[PDB]
Amino acid sequence: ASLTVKAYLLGKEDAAREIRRFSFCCSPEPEAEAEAAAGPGPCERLLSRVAALFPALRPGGFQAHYRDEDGDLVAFSSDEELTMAMSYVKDDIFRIYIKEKKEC
Amino acid sequence: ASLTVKAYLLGKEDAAREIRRFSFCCSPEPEAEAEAAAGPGPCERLLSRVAALFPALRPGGFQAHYRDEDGDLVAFSSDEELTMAMSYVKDDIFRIYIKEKKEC
Amino acid sequence: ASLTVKAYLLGKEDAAREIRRFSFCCSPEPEAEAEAAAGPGPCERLLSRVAALFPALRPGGFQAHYRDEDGDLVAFSSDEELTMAMSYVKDDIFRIYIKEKKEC
Amino acid sequence: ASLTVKAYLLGKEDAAREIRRFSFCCSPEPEAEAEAAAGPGPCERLLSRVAALFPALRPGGFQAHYRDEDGDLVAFSSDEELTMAMSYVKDDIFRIYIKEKKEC
Amino acid sequence: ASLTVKAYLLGKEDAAREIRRFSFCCSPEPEAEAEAAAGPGPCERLLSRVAALFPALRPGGFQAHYRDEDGDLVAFSSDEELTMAMSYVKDDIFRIYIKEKKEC
Amino acid sequence: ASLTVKAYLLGKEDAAREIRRFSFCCSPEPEAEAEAAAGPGPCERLLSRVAALFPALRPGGFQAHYRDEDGDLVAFSSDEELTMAMSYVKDDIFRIYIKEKKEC
Amino acid sequence: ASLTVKAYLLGKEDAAREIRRFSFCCSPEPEAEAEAAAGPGPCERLLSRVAALFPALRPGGFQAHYRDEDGDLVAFSSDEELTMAMSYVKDDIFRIYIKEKKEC
Amino acid sequence: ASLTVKAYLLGKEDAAREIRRFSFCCSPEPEAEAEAAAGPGPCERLLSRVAALFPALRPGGFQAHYRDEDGDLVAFSSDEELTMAMSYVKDDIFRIYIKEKKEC
Amino acid sequence: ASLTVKAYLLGKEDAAREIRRFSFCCSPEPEAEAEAAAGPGPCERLLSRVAALFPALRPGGFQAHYRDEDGDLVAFSSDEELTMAMSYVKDDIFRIYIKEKKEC
């Protein structure tokens, strides 16, 4: 399941500041034997890869979102919630919206 | 009865600060034998799951609401009152509105 | 006679601070034999249930009101006066307005 | 019954000088057999724990209060009066107000 | 007849120095047979309980008051006068005002 | 459990004078055998590390705080109270507020 | 690891008075044999080079800072804390903010 | 038990003339075998050390005090009374107040 | 351990009359063999150097102080007390306050 993720980085008034467009492999998985318990999570691997590409942000300091049917930026941080996020993929493009974690 | 809960977290002037959109299983129930008296309540399981997802709040320190026909944010904390809250579900989306418990 | 009571809790300048919306069973009554003299009163059961739901108030320390045709918050504390309060029900919603009993 | 006590230490013009926020276990009780007559009292265990946390005060030399509906700092020193103090708990936070015992 | 007594202890310029807020059982009475002539009086039981709570005063050395409609601190020491004092109870709170017996 | 502590040093009117931002390892612990009774405490190791970084203060002469839901600077000095302090961590940043111990 | 350091020298109201922009070689290191124990530290070499360039300050009399995600000038003086400072480098520019050590 | 003693030497109108701030080891004690009956007393070792530091006074000719909760300079000369003096230590600072023994 | 001593000479109303700012070498020590018993003391070498610089005072006729956390001028004359004085060094500046020994 080759899945393209188009990571929007949002700015001041929720206008996009930098777009990245990488590829992601959620349903694919490594070798079918346990070298660990079971890897990282599918949302933990996503946020580890969004943090690796953008130079403008550091890992652990950003909140990834998506747009639902109402147009609202629904956040996601879990991997049982990333599966609800990915039911909104249009063609193969999973558009996420990155916002940084400021003061309050 | 698969039931989607869209948890709005309200901010200063009752504008939404973070939206979460999880799924909830009120009328479904576990195995039909008593390992306890009868679990937690259906409102106790809801507020335990809203507190688990949001990192910005801690359990026991938030008031969950809903909108009635007048547009007012009617609060609910009981499980005989959650059944009146859930008679306002539109398609399968049960929109609740979270407010934190401040000074006075 | 299923009767919905929408309990407004009034604040500083008579603006609503918390709304509760429960159901009430005035004209319904229990088993048709005397285990007591005759229960509590229909206004005593109402104020015992408004005090049970709101965590922000304690029983015996609040005054329940209603709006008459002039727009004034007419208070009620009796059960021969609750019957005059309930002649203002609109559809099945009996809107009461709770005010706490402060210093003077 | 997990119960949070937020101990305000009052200063010169009844402004708070140090706040402590511990937890208290009034209605919980130890093993259901008598190793003594019946422990200390529930108010004696409270004032023994407020004195243990604050370094600025010594046991036997402080008066614990609470706010009633009038806004007045009602004192309490008994354990049949601590039960009237604890009917003012809001969520689970039992706010007491500590004042030291000076000259006159 | 559960009756709450809020005992104000007055200070120098009739400003309250310590407030106590206990409960009192005037119209309730013990077992309906004579183990004595008839107990203490209802004012004798009140002043015995106000003296038991306050550590700052000793029994027989304080004058309990109440406020009438004129705002004056009307004293009471009898139990045929305590019945006139208790016709000024507002909700269930019988506010008395304690003054100590000094030189002259 | 890698945990970032952002130590605010408060000044005259509780405005921050110097911020330090170190890392802390509360739930991690050394080798699983007793070279001592059990180390220092988790609050004793925290205050030993806050004192090591700031040159402007000396150990034993500062009071570490945190902000609760009311916005109040709740102090903590125990290690059964540091566990209640650390239930307010937002992302992984545990903001403490340092105040020095002056005259009175 | 060629790393550019842009040293802001702050003035009265934290406005920059002189900017210097040198280069720094933290992760690079000299010959792989011990002519000493291990050189100076990576923060000791940084503050020795900031003091060498600015004529307006003398070594040992300035506090180097950085901006975190909250916009606060977090100070650093250690070399286990300089490694947390350098996780905020944007492209290759490590912006530090110099403040002098005055009276109090 | 490392215990800091801040010895105020009082002057004419009980204003401090010279402050000394030494350290004291009351609860610590020497080798656990009797080379004597049991040393000097813990108050005898304190007054022998206050006399050793101040050049302005000679041993046997000064009265050491402390402040109680009333603000009064309570004197102490015994070692069963020094244990009541040391229940007023604030952080680890045991403030004593020295007065010399004049005519009458 | 290069240590800067800023010697304030106090005047009439404890206002500084002359400031000197020399350097001091407490923890450094001479050749590691005994040409004497062990030199002078570290406080004896300090007061011998403060007396050498100021022309306005003569040795043996001045009392050196320091400020503690309370703002009080704590005196020191011993070398087991100079080690408690030097735990208040801020950057490397050990501010002492010189007062001359007048009549009484």
Author numbering:
A (entry chain A), B (entry chain A), C (entry chain A), D (entry chain A), E (entry chain A), F (entry chain A), ...: 2 to 105
Task: Show passages lifted from the paper.
PB1 domains form homotypic interactions via conserved electrostatic motifs molded by basic or acidic surface patches on opposite faces of their ubiquitin-like β-grasp fold.
Using the derived symmetries, we determined the 3.5/3.9- (L-type, p62/AtNBR1) and 4.0/4.4 Å- (S-type, p62/AtNBR1) resolution structures. The β1–α1 loop in p62 is flexible and only visible in the L-type assembly density. The main interactions are formed between a double arginine finger formed by two neighboring arginine residues in strand β2 (R19–R20AtNBR1/R21–22p62) stabilizing strong salt bridges to acidic residues (D60/D62/D64/D73AtNBR1 or D69/D71/D73/E82p62) in the OPCA motif located in the β2–β3 loop and the α2 helix.
